[PDB]
Amino acid sequence: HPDISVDVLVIGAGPTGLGAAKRLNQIDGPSWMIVDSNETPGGLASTDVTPEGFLYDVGGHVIFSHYKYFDDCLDEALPKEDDWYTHQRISYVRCQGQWVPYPFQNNISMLPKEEQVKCIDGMIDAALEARVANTKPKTFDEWIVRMMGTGIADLFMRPYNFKVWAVPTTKMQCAWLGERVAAPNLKAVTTNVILGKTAGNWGPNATFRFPARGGTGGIWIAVANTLPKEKTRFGEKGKVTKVNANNKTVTLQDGTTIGYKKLVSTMAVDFLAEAMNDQELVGLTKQLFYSSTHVIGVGVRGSRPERIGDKCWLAFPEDNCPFYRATIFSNYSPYNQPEASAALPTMQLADGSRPQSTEAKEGPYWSIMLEVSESSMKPVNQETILADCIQGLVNTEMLKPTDEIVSTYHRRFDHGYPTPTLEREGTLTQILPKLQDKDIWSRGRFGSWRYEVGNQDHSFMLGVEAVDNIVNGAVELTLNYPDFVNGRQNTERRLVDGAQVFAKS
Amino acid sequence: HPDISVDVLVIGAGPTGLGAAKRLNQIDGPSWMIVDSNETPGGLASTDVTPEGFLYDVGGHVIFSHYKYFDDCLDEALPKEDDWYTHQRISYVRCQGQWVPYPFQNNISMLPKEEQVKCIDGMIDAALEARVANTKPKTFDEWIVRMMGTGIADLFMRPYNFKVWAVPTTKMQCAWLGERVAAPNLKAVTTNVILGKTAGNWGPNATFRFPARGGTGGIWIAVANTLPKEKTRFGEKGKVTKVNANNKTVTLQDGTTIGYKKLVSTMAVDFLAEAMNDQELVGLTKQLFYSSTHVIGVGVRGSRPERIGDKCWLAFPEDNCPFYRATIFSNYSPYNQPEASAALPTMQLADGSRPQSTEAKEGPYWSIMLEVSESSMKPVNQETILADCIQGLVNTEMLKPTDEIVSTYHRRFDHGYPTPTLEREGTLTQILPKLQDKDIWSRGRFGSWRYEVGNQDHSFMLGVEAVDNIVNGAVELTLNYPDFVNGRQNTERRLVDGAQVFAKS
Amino acid sequence: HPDISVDVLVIGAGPTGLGAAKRLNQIDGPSWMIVDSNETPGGLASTDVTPEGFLYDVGGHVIFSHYKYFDDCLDEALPKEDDWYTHQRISYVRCQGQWVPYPFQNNISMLPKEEQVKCIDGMIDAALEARVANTKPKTFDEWIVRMMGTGIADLFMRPYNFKVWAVPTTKMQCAWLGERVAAPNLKAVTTNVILGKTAGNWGPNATFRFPARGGTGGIWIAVANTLPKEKTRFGEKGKVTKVNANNKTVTLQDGTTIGYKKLVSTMAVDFLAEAMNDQELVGLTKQLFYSSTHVIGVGVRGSRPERIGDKCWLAFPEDNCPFYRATIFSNYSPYNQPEASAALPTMQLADGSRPQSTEAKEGPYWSIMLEVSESSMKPVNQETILADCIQGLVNTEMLKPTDEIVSTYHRRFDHGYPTPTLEREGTLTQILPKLQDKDIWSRGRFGSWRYEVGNQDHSFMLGVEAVDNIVNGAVELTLNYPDFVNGRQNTERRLVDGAQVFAKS
Amino acid sequence: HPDISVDVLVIGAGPTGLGAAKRLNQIDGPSWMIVDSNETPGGLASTDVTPEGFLYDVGGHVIFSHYKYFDDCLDEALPKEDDWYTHQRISYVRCQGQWVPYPFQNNISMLPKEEQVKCIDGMIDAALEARVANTKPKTFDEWIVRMMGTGIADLFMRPYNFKVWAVPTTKMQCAWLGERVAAPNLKAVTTNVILGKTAGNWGPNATFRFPARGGTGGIWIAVANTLPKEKTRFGEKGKVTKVNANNKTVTLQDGTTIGYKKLVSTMAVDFLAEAMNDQELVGLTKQLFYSSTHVIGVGVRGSRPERIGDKCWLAFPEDNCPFYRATIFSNYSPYNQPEASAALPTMQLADGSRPQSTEAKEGPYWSIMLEVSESSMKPVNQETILADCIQGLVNTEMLKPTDEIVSTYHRRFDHGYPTPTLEREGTLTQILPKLQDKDIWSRGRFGSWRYEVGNQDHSFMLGVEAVDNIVNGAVELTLNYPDFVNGRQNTERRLVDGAQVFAKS
Fold first, then answer.
1. Where are the beta strands (DSSP E) in D105-230?
2. H/E element holding C155?
3. Count of H helices and E strands in chain B?
4. In C, which residues are within 8 Å of A186 by CB distance?
5. For residues A312, A317, A321 and A322, what is the CA-based torsion angle, rounded to 10 degrees?
6. Who among C116, C186, C187 is closest to A194 (CB)?
7. Which sign, positive or negative, has the C-alpha torsion B126, B131, B133, B137?
8. Contact B186 D113 (CB under 8 A)
9. DSSP 8-state code for residue C446
C-alpha cells in the first residue's frame, strides 16, 4: 500500500493544476492533493526578479478571460482594487522605421505609397479569389495569404510568425485560428489608406488588468494560498519521478508513493510518457513539436521615453532583431521595477560601451521584456543572445546608443510554445485517448498541447473542467472545442454554484 | 409558510420533467419534488389504448438518442433484452403511385424519365448557383430550393412540410436544420438516376429500439417508477393552477402550496405565463406559434399484407390524403395490438361500407397510426377527419376497399409541434431570460419551444442539464446549442458519475 | 419617263451623301447624281457664323478617323499643311469645383477623401460582382454601374448621360458601347487614388486635326468641290419632296423628276417614310427616338484665360448648368473668331448686365460653344436657354461675372442625336431591310440611326460602303458591324484602288 | 522584258486560284492569267480513279458553303439538278463496339452505365468550373476538357485529335475553333442520358450536295472550264520553278517568264519561299507545321450492308485502326464506283485470304475511303499502311472477314493539313506581311495556312477576296477574320454584281 492515497491526484501547480485544485476544493467531495516540483506555484505564469529588483514574467503575459469562473478565482485571490492596474491593449508592429498600430493591414497608410499600391493590389487579388473560394485553407500560410494577400503577408504575418513559432507558416495548420473565413476586409483596408488614417484595435473598453505586485506570478501564489496547505506538496518533496499507470501509483523524488483513483497531469505530456516508462507513448509524444522561449529582460535608467509612451507590447517581423516580441513591462505596474529613489550603477550603455562612472545613481527606471524563440529549425546562440537582443533594441530605435542599462535578465524555457503543426491533431488523438483509458487526464499548455486554448484562463479551466468531468460528468469543452469556449463568455460555472448554496442551508 | 418547501420544484413529468427528476435523484443533494396533472407520467411520449386493445402513441415516436445519459436511464428502466424490439429505420415517401425510399432525391429513378429530367435540370441550376453563393438562406423554403432545386422541392419537401408544420415553408426559419451548407449533392443524385438505382438511408447500423409493451409510454412509466414515490405528485393532486414567481410559491388545484428556491417548469410556456398571471409574458408567448396534432389509429384484420412489409413510417406530400405521416405501428411491437386469437367484430370496410357480418372474428391484426396537423393557417374539419384518413388509406393503396377495420382511434393534441417560425428566436430571447431572472428554468418541447431539440432524448436532457446548471453550474448545451449536441455523441454524463462512486467509497 | 435618269441617286450631301458621291465618282462606272435641299453641303457637319464674325460648328465636332479612305478624301480636299491645326484630345469633367481629367474614374484623387472612399467602396462592390457575373448588362445604366460602381456612376456618367441623351440611362441599350466586358479596372483606379495621381487620356499620340478655315463645314465644302458640278443639284432646286419607291422615281420641289435604279438616301429615315407616303414605314419610324440639339455660342473679349488654357471640350454632369458639353472653340482655330484688331462693342457682361457704352473695343477674342439636349422627356425653354447657358458659364467658373460678351449664337437642330433606346434595333430590323428590298439604301446618322457609327468618318463611309455594296458586292461593315470597324484600322479601301491604277495603264 | 506580262498572275488552280480567276474574269478589268503544274485543275479538291473504276477524293470532302459567291460559281459550273446528289450530314464516332451519333457527348447513353457516370461526373466538374472561369483556354486540350470534362474528353476528342492532327492536343492553339465559350451543355448531355436518347446533329435541314460525276474534282474541272482557255496554262507547261519578287517575274519549267504587277500565290507558302530563293522566308516557313495525309480506298463487292446503311463519314478515336476517318464514298454518288453489271475479280478477302475463284464476277459494289495522318510525331509505315487499314476495317466491324475486296487505292499527300500549332500565328504574322510588302498575296489552305478557313469554300473565297482587295480595296475578311465569315451568311458578293449589270446597259 502507498504512503498516501487520494481519489484525485493533481500533478503540477501552474494555472491548470491550480484550476483542478480550486474546483476540487470547492466541490469538497472526493479526496485530493496537488504536487509540484517547484516550491512556488505558477509554472510558466510565474515571475522572476533580478538582483537589481527588476521583475520579469515568462515573456509577455496579458490576461483576457473567457470565463467568469476564472474571474471569480482571481477576484478571490486578489480582492482589492489596488491589487490591480488596468491598461488598454496597446500594441504595434515595427516595420520600416515605423511603429504601425495593430492590426497591421488597417495601418499601412504609414508605409511608402508604392508599397501601399503593392499591398492593396495583393489584397484585391485575395478578395476576388475569396469571392469564388470553395475550399478551406489547409496551412497557416494559406490562411494568411487568403486573409491579407501576398504583399501584406510578406511584410508582417509570414516573417513574424517564423520568428514566433520557429517553424515556417507552411508547416502549421490553421484550424486553431477558428472558424472565421480566410478573406480580406478590403473596404476597411482601402478606406484607411485613402483617408491616410491609422487606428489600433484598442480603446476604453479593450483593456486588461495586471497585478500590482509580484508580476503575473503574484496571481497564482495568491490563488494557491486559498487552498488547504496540507493538501499541497510543493518543492523537491513534490517532484514526480515515476508514474505507474497500471497500479495507479506515483513515486516522488524523495521516495514517497501516492495512490490515486483518477490522475490529472499537467506536466508536459512528453515528460509524462517518460515518467510512465511507456515506450509507445514516448514514441507518439516525440511526434509532437514545440519551441523553446528565451526571455531577455533589460532595465533602463530614466523616465519613460516619449517614443515609448503607452505602448504595451510590440511585434517584430524584420530581421534586424532576434526577438519576435517586446513588452514595456514597466508600463504594466510601477512595482515591476525599483522606485525612482533606488540607487543603481550603470552596467553598460545600449551600444555596449562602459559607463563613464561606476557610481550608483537614482532612477526612475523603465523596463523592456523580450522573447526569442528557439527550435531545431531556428537555433539560438545562448552565449550571444543577450547582446544580440540589446543590439536589436538599438536597431529598432527602442533604445538610444546612450541609454543606460542597469539590469539584465536571461532565462531559457525549454517547453515554451506547443506548436500547431500540421501533424499535431493526428498525434494528439492517439495520445490523449490512450492516457484517458488509463484514467489519466493529461491537460494544460503542454499537458494537452493546444495553443489555441493555451492562455492562463484556458489552462486554469482545463484543470477545472477535467475535475468536473471526473466528478460530475461534464463535457471538457475547452479541451475539445476551442472555437466554442473562445466564441462566448462562459458564465454558467461559478466559484459558488447551487451545490454549495444548498449544502450550507 | 407554504405546505411544502423544496429546493427545486419540477413541474411536469413528461420526458423533460422526468429528466430533471432523474438527475436530482442521482445528485441526491438539494431537496426536490415533481408534480404532474396526469396520474400517468409521459406527456406527449405517452400511449393510449382503444377499447379493442390497439395501442397508439401520440403519432410516430421513433427514438434516436444523442446521449449516453438517456441510454442509461432507459436501460435502468427496462433492463431486459425482451423489454425491447429492434428495427431498421425503414421509411418511404408516397409519390405518384409509388413508395420512394427516403431520402427522396436519391431515389427519383423510380419516377417517369421526363420527370427525372425536370428534377435534374432543377438541381443543376441549384448546383451552379451554390457554386457562387455567398449568403445563407433565410427561410426554410430558400434552404429547400438551394438543396434540392425547384423540381425536386415541388415534388416532396415543399408540399410535405406544409402538411407537417401547417404553415408554408416561406414562413419558417432554417437555422434549426443545422450548419450544413444548403447545396445539392448533384453527383450522388445523378449517379443513382444514371444507374437506375434506389437506396434507402437504413441498414444494420441504422436501427431503433421500441418497447415490447405499453408503447412509448411504457418507457416513461418505468423511468418514473425508479423515483422515490414520496417525492412525486401525479394526478389531480399534482395539477398546477397558479405560479407566484415573486413569492417563489406554486399553488395546486387542491389548494396545496409549494415553496421553491428554483423552478424547473416543463409545461407549455404559454400555459406557464397564464399560471403566473404575468401579462407581459402572456403577450410574449402569444408571439410563438404551434400546430395541433390529430392522431388517428386504424386497427385492421389480417396478416400483414406484402404491400406493407417491413415499412416503419411513411411520408405523404400529395393531396390524396390528409395525413403527413403513417406509421405501421404493428411492426413496432407484437403487443401494440391484440393477439390473433382475440375475437373482434368488423366495424367497417375501408371503403366506408357496413360489414356483411356483425359477428366477432379472429385475427391476426395489424395497425396503422396517422398524423394530421392543424393550425390557424391550415384548418381541419374535425367531424370528418377519421373518415378522410381512412379514405386516404384507400387512395394511397395502404388499405384495399375490402379490408376489415376492427378498431378506430382519434385524438387531438392542442400543442403538437412548436413551429420554427422566422419570429421564434426574437420572441424566445425575450421570454427565456425574463423567466431565468426569476429562477425559473422553462424547458422542454413547449417549455422552451425548440423543435430541433424537441425529441424524447433532447427533452429528457433539457431537464437533466437544467438541474446540472442549477446545481453544478453546467452549460445548458441542448437548450442553447442544438447543432452542438446533435452533431456529437454525448458520452460524458452518466447515471453513475464519479461523484456517486467516490461518495459510496 | 422622268426628266432625269441615273443608275444611282444620292439624296443628301452631308458626309454620308458626299461619301457615296466620292466613291461613285472614283469608280466612274454607273451614272449618278446627288441632291441636297441646302446650297451648302455638309449637313450637321456644317458651320455657321454670327454677324460679329464668330464661327460655330453644330456643337463640338472632333474628328477621329477609323478609315484611310476618309483620310484620303480629307487630304485631297485640304492638301496643305496650313489647311489644318493639330491639337491633343484634351478634355475634362466639371465636378465639385474641379476640372477632372477624362477618364473620370482615373482622376478621382482630385475629389475630397470622403468622396474617394465612397467611389472606391462602390467600385469594390462592382469588382466582386463582376467576378461571378455570367450575364451581359441589358441597359446603359446597368453597363455603367457594372463598370464604375454606384458612387462613381452617380457622380458622372449617370447624370451626365441624361443631360446628353435627354433620356434616362435606364432607357438605353448598351451593345452600342462595344464588346468589352462591363467590369471595373479597380487596380488602376485605386492605384491613382493611392499615389494621388491624375492622368488624362491624351498625349502626343492622341490628337485631332481641325480645319484652319471655315470650321468643320470647310471640309465638306472642299470635298463637294472635288465632284463634277453637273452631277450635283444643291439648293431649293435639289429639295426632295416625294419618293415613289414602286416607280423608282423621286420628285423635287421644283417639279423635276428623277428616275433611279438604286437609291442611296441619307435624309432622316422618318423624313424618308413621309416622303414615300408609306404609312406602315411612317408608323415604324415613329418608334425610333431622337433628341434635338441646341447649340449656343458665346464670343468673349480678352486673351484666353489661364483657367481655360488648352482645354478642348468639357463635360458637365452637375445641375448648375443646362449644357452637357462646352467646347473652347477658339482653341480649334485662330480663324474661328475675329482677329485681335477687330472692333466690337460689348453686348452684355456674363452676369447678365448691360455694358456702359456702345464703344467698339478691340480684342483679342475667345469663344465658347455649348450644347443643350432636348426631347419629349426633357423640355428646353427656348426663350431663356441663352441666358441660362451664360449663367451656367458663371456657375462653372468658365466666365467671370465681369467678362465682356461680344457675340451670341443660338440655333436648334431638330434631329440632333439618334438615341440608342432599348427598342432601337428591333425597330430598325423592321425598317432597313424593307427599304433594302425596294433598292433603297437608307444610311447615315439618321439615315440608319446608329450613333455608334454616327460620326463624320462613319457617316462618310456608310455612304462609301453602300455604293460599294451596290456596285461591287461589298459587305456594309460599318452599317452592320460597328464593333468590327471601330476596333481596327480600316486601311484596305483607298481613293485610288488597283482598279483605277490598272485602268489608266 | 518577260515573255508574258499580266496585271495579276495567279499561281495554282486548286479552289483558291480558281476563286481568284473567277473574280478576275468577272471584273474583266486588269489583265490576268492562271498557271498550274497539273493539267487537271482542283488541287487537293481533285479526284483519282483506280484501274477497276473506283473514284476517291483526297479523303472525305463534304461541302458546307458560307458564301453566296461560291454557290453562284458551283451552280454556273454544274447547273442541272441531276449534276448533284443531296444527302444529310450523317456521321458517327466508333467507340467500344458502338456507332455513336455525332455529337459524341449527346449520345453517351450508348455506353455502359458505369462509364456514363464517370462521363457525367467529369462534365459536372467542368460545368462548376465554367461558372467561375475568368480566363480563356490557351490550348486545344484545355478547350476540350473545359467543354467536355475529363471522362468524355478521354473517350473521344483527345485520342481522336491526335489521330487527326498527328500532334497532341496540348500542342495546338484553340482560337481557331471560334469565340464560343468553352463550357459544357450539361443539361443537354444529362437529358439525353436520362431519356436513353440518341440524336445526331443532322436532319432534312443539315444536308450537303455532292457531284453526280467525277467526284469533288468534277466541280473544279467544270468551274475551270468557264474560264477563257487562253488565260490558263495547265500542266508541265505551267509549273512555276522560280519567283523573282524584286523583279516581279515568274519563271516556268519550260523557261517561259511572266511579269506581273500583283501576285496571287496559292502554292504551299513553304514551297513559295523556296521558289523565291528567300532565305529569311525559308527559315520562317520552316517554323510552320503540317501533317501529311494517306488516302486509302477499298472497293467492296456487295449491296450496301445493313450495318453501314446511310452513314456518310465516321470518326475513330480508338487504336484498333490507323485511320482517323472513314467515308462511305459509295453513298455520295452511284457514279463513284462501277455499275452492278461491271465484272471484277476478287483481289482478296478482308481478312487477307485469297479468294476461292479468280473469275470476274458482277456487283453491285460499295466503297470505303480512309484517311491516315502522318507527321514527325506520328510516323506511317507506307509499306504496310494499306494492309493495316484493311485489318482496321475488320477490327471496327466495317468489313466482315469474308467481305470481297475488288479494288484498293493508296496515295500519300505530303501537305495534307496545316496545323493550328501554338506557334502558328507568331510565324504567319511575320511571313504574310513580308510577302505583302512585295505585292504577293499568298493565300489558300497552304498559301495562308489557316485550317479554320481551309475548306473548299473558304479557299475559293480567299482567292476571290484577294483579287477584290487588289482591285476594289476590299477587306480580306476570310483571311484575317475567320470567326466573322464563319459566323454569318456571306450574301453580298455575287457572280453578277451591280458593276456588270450597269455596264451591260
1. 207-211
2. helix C150-155
3. 16, 19
4. 124
5. 90
6. C116
7. positive
8. no
9. T
Among the listed residues D181, D146, D186, the one whose alpha carbon sits nearest the alpha carbon of residue B122: D186
Between CA D499 and CA D502, with CA D500 as vertex, the angle to 5 degrees is 70
Q: Looking at domain D7-505, which CATH architecture does it have?
A: 3-Layer(bba) Sandwich (3.50)
Q: How far is CA B392 from the centre of its chain?
A: 22
Q: Three cell numbers at B157? A: 419537401
The amino acid at B51: P
Residue of A nearest to B465 (CA): A474
Q: Residue D112 carries which side chain, given as an amino acid letter?
A: P
* Interface list for chain D against chain C, based on CB atoms closer than 8 Å: 7, 27, 29-31, 69, 131-132, 134, 261-262, 468-477, 481, 484, 490, 492-494, 497-499, 502-503, 505
CB atoms within 10 A of CB C269: 26
Which among C262, C493, C498 has CB closest to D470?
Answer: C498
Q: In 10 A of CB C219, how many CB atoms?
A: 29
Q: Is the dihedral of CA D230, D233, D236, D239 positive or negative?
A: positive
C-alpha span between B129 and B132 (Å, rounded): 6
For residue D291, give every residue at least 6 positions away whose Cβ sits within 8 Å of its Cβ, in sequence order, or none.
D165, D166, D167, D373, D374, D375, D378, D416, D417, D419
Euclidean distance between CA atoms B406 and B346, whole angstroms: 5
Q: Cell 463611309 maps to which residue?
A: C461
Bridge partners (DSSP) listed for residue B92: B101, B314
| Shortest Cα–Cα distance, D246 to chain C (Å) | 20
Residue B328 grid coordinates? 405501421
Question: Running DSSP on this structure, what letter comes out for residue B110?
Answer: G
Q: CB distance D132–B128 less than 8 Å?
A: no
Across the interface, of B113, B128, B190, the residue whose CB is closest to D131 is B128
Beta bridge mates, A210: A85
- What is the DSSP secondary structure assignment for residue C241, as one 8-state letter? E
Question: What was the experiment behind these coordinates?
Answer: X-ray
Which H helix or E strand runs over D58?
Answer: none
- D177 C-beta neighbours (distance < 10 Å), count: 18
Contact residues, chain D, for C482 at CB < 8 Å:
none
Widest distance between CA atoms in chain C: 75
Q: Which of B184, B197, B194 is nearest to B101 (CA)?
A: B197
Nearest 5°: phi and psi at A151?
-60, -50
Q: To the nearest 10°, the Cα dihedral for B109, B110, B116, B122?
A: -80
C103: preceding bond cis by omega (within 30 degrees): yes
Cell numbers at D68, concatenated = 453566296
Q: Give, rounded to a whole angstrom, the gap between the first and last alpha carbons of chain A.
A: 39
Give CA–CA dist A100/A93, Å, rounded: 5
Residue type, A351: D
Residues of chain A found within 8 Å of residue C128, distances taken between Cβ atoms:
127-128, 131
Q: How far apart (Å, rounded) are the C-alpha atoms in residues C465 and C468?
A: 5
Q: Report yes or no: C345 and C33 within 8 Å, Cβ to Cβ.
A: no
CA angle B39, B43, B44 (to 5 degrees): 145
Helix (H) or strand (E) holding C475: none
How far off is chain A from B355, nearest CA to CA, in Å?
Answer: 60
HSE of C234, CA atoms in CB hemisphere, 13 A:
20
Domain parsing of chain B, residue ranges? 7-505
Calculated CA dihedral for residues C20, C22, C28, C30, nearest 10 degrees: 20
Distance from CA of C104 to the nearest CA of A (A): 17
Quick one: cell of C362? Answer: 478691340
The 10 Å Cβ neighbour count of residue A36 is: 27
- For residue A404, CA distances in Å to A300, A352, D474 come to 6, 10, 88
Closest to C449 in 3D by CA, of C475, C473, C426, C474: C426
CB contact under 8 A, C121 and A195: no
